[PDB]
Design a binder for these strands. Structure first.
Ligand SMILES: [Zn+2]
Lengths: 78, 106, 91, 69, 13, 94, 89, 106, 82, 94, 90
DNA sequence: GGAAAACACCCAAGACACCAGGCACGAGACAGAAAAAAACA
DNA sequence: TGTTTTTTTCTGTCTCGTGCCTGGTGTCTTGGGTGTTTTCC
């Protein structure tokens, strides 16, 4: 379901960054880099959860993993 | 909860070993200045033969158990488990020979 | 053009420092003077500063070369310097 | 996005429940990362005298950022 | 030693 | 069990600086996260810097030096002045 | 006895599973296919290591921790059948 | 009357809470007396600055509600605050309006 | 006193550093910008190093402080202690 | 160390953990595990450095060889991305 | 204190005929100290998160998976596990 | 600018002793947190 | 109609008092490392 990140949505995301024109081949590249980033953060959150002896990933594990990667997130109980 | 110190043979609560150390073995195990690691390896909660000594110097029992140079208190005839090889080597570095109290060595 | 590649081949195989020692020492002392006076410096601290500054400048020149390559040019320009610094996050 | 997160998480160990707040935090972080990457890629495109971003600018931005080795 | 520590007559009862 | 937070104090200082302005719950969460993060940064820097000099105490000196190490620019100077003002005020009372 | 816990009160052991998959069923090697047919909620963590119904089965053999007070360590009488079933793998 | 340490130092932030968190947050065996007061004062000044700039930015928007958008505006529009909070993402904060000069048509 | 010493970082030195980075051609305006960047970097490292020395009541900057300071800037140095 | 079959000093790691102000207590398995991890990693990097030195017809390992061994390995340079080796030079790349 | 003797032992284990310079020795000491600091600090951070006061083999293991990347960590975890049973068994 | 030499002296390291200061145990309590009632947009 | 300020019950965590160990500070001595200066290349 990587195709679920649809073309208008990624167009909107590029548009927030101030981009005027979009190449036709860029969408697969953005899907790939988003997959890589999500893979890394999800992996770290999952092993945090496995160390915590839990079966449900909470928001704290996600914020912890992100802050450990230098991508500190405010607003979710950090 | 009480544990028997493997080296000297004294018996004290495990939290007493964690907070204050072994009063006799502190000079060579540094138990008062050590983590639960050394408490767990050098003291065992499974033992047998509770011994109370009043006068270490003249008690033949104290000489027989090699505890006549230690603090009076609760002692164990047999202690399950032995000291690790690294701790034995460290004691041999200090010049002190370790004789196990597990009963398997005689 | 040939000697440019010769210089690249010579310097990429060598390991000695390329910044001259005494001007860098005077530069470090001149910068440190305006924070506190009568400051002494260990020689190893000056050597550590020299090594770190050289490594940082080498990395910056490599990223700048990538930026110059991007714009279909072979000559690096100051706009490449501030582009690399801006993207890398320095201000 | 929730289905994608579940698909990625399935590969390590199943039966892993994902709180709504965790999915929302993941979405916010992913959007922030993508917006920052597109800002850097727009700077790259402007530098090359173009107004259209191409995958080569994406790769270069990731290269200079250190994300790609 | 261990063998020498055997009980004697003058040891406490 | 309950969970402590800095919400009331943030609301108090907001009412001190802006009497006619309130604040949403999400902004309260962001402010709480911000205060917690700054706390962890300063405490960790002070703990490290104290460990460097083989010292066992975090005093006002370690916190002051950590503040100078983290805060960028004039903010540090202003913070340092007010912190010193607080300490001597505490020292002037009992 | 695959693993001995350092505490000495329990130990992780290799056993033959006893399940009916949905008064005890006879012992038999863990059948993953029948378990999936009778219960498709099997979880997987590694290769050859299967978790079914909260119990960890490694290549058809159960691995479950058991207390020291639940074991006989002396006068053990082994059988050829159980020996062959354990050493076949 | 047992007066609070916050009232003694003229602060709104809890001196006792930061003292407890420093003592319990595994940094060093002992914590000096002036450190919680100093840390609480620094936290107060910083939160005062952030809330001030955010209230002002809300005030230009003719709003009485502080939202994450105003916090993001206050953080990113101040140079030193942007330097300090460089690597943080504000949830529901958005992005500052910035369009390049040569991006515009002629 | 020391005045206008940054020019001591010579133009061939910048050339050699660029050659190490694989740069083939160099513009004439690169040198002043490079000197400015080096000055900014040195100021950033030296500020933290001198703060570390001032807290310890020392009068000499040691190598350990410079290591600690670059590591605090995310520029960890191997070979000079730590 | 002899009981665990290791060359690194387990007691040294235990002492550093105890006096390093990380936690109140340290289990017995933690210093052994940490020493084993350190030994495996140092064996790996020294193995690659010796291979690089052999390829360079040298008998003594130089920081140039350590830089080459670290930068030519994807896992090692991924681990050590933000590390600059003194007297290491740069990787030859034209 | 330094790790010179132990690095010499593992070097002569893997390469008996190869020597090493003093600068490389300092580099090795810095590397070992840095890796130790990273692993121990992350394990402490995990202990703080789970409201635990004891560092056991578990948090060290999970810190090893958190920091070291790829196959490396797996082999390192395997090596650590073997050391633990070697400490235990023996 | 480097190499080498030769003083000057400033300053970091280390040992002994003394005491100001922070932890430890424990009682009182009053300020913080949740339930809830009402107000405003 | 729902987000939010204010009231109230409830509880738990801060303050204060006494003691007691010891970490930090001061001082004095000593070696050694770096700054300053000459001179040749
Ligand atoms: Zn003992």
């Amino acid at each position: 379901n990587i195709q679920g990140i649809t073309k208008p949505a990624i167009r909107r995301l590029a548009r927030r960054g101030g981009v005027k024109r979009i190449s036709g081949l860029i969408y697969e590249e953005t899907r790939g880099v988003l997959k890589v980033f999500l893979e890394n953060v999800i992996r770290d959150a999952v092993t945090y959860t496995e160390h915590a002896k839990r079966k449900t990933v909470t928001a704290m594990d996600v914020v912890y993993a992100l802050k450990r990667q230098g991508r500190t997130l405010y607003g979710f109980g950090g | 909860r009480e544990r028997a110190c493997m080296l000297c043979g004294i018996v004290l609560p495990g939290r007493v070993f964690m907070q204050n150390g072994c009063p006799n073995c502190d000079s060579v195990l540094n138990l008062r200045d050590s983590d639960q690691a050394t408490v767990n390896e050098c003291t065992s909660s499974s033992f047998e033969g509770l011994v109370a000594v009043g006068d270490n110097e003249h008690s033949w029992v104290a000489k027989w158990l090699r505890v006549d140079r230690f603090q009076p208190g609760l002692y164990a005839v047999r202690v399950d488990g032995r000291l690790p090889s690294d701790i034995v080597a460290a004691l041999e570095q200090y010049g002190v020979y370790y004789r196990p109290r597990d009963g398997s060595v005689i | 053009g040939t000697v440019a590649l010769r210089e690249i081949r010579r310097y990429q195989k060598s390991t000695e420092l390329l910044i001259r020692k005494l001007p860098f020492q005077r530069l470090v002392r001149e910068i440190a003077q305006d924070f506190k006076t009568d400051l002494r410096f260990q020689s190893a601290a000056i050597g550590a500063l020299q090594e770190a500054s050289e490594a940082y400048l080498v990395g910056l020149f490599e990223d700048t070369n990538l930026c110059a390559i991007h714009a279909k040019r072979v000559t690096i320009m100051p706009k490449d310097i501030q582009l690399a610094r801006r993207i890398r996050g320095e201000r | 996005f929730q289905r994608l997160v579940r698909e990625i998480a399935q590969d390590f160990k199943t039966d892993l429940r994902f709180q709504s707040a965790a999915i929302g935090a993941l979405q916010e972080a992913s959007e922030a990362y993508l917006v920052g990457l597109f800002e850097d890629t727009n700077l790259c495109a402007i530098h090359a005298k173009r107004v259209t971003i191409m995958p080569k600018d994406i790769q270069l931005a990731r290269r200079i950022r250190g994300e790609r080795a | 030693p261990q063998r020498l520590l055997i009980p004697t007559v003058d040891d406490p009862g | 069990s309950r969970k402590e937070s800095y919400s009331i104090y943030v609301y108090k200082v907001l009412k001190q600086v802006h009497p006619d302005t309130g604040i949403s719950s999400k902004a309260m969460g962001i402010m709480n996260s911000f205060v917690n993060d700054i706390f962890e940064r300063i405490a960790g820097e002070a703990s490290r810097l104290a460990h460097y000099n083989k010292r066992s105490t975090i005093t006002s000196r370690e916190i002051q030096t950590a503040v100078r190490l983290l805060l960028p620019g004039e903010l540090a100077k202003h913070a340092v002045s007010e912190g010193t003002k607080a300490v001597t005020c505490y020292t002037s009372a009992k | 006895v695959d693993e001995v816990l350092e505490n000495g009160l329990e130990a992780r052991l290799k056993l033959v599973p006893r399940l009916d998959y949905g008064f005890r069923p006879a012992q038999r090697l863990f059948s993953e296919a029948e378990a999936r047919v009778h219960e498709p909620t099997i979880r997987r963590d590694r290769d050859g290591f299967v978790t079914y119904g909260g119990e960890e089965y490694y290549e058809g053999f159960l691995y479950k921790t058991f207390r020291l007070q639940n074991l006989i360590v002396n006068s053990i009488n082994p059988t050829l059948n159980e020996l062959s079933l354990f050493q076949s793998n | 009357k047992a007066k609070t340490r916050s009232s003694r130092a003229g602060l709104q932030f809890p001196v006792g809470r930061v003292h407890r968190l420093l003592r319990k947050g595994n940094y060093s065996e002992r914590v000096g007396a002036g450190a919680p007061v100093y840390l609480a004062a620094v936290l107060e000044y910083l939160t005062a600055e952030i809330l001030e700039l955010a209230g002002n930015a809300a005030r230009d928007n003719k709003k009485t509600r502080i939202i994450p958008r105003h916090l993001q505006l206050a953080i990113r529009n101040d140079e030193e605050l942007n330097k300090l909070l460089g690597r943080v993402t504000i949830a529901q904060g958005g992005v500052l309006p910035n369009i390049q000069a040569v991006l515009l048509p002629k």
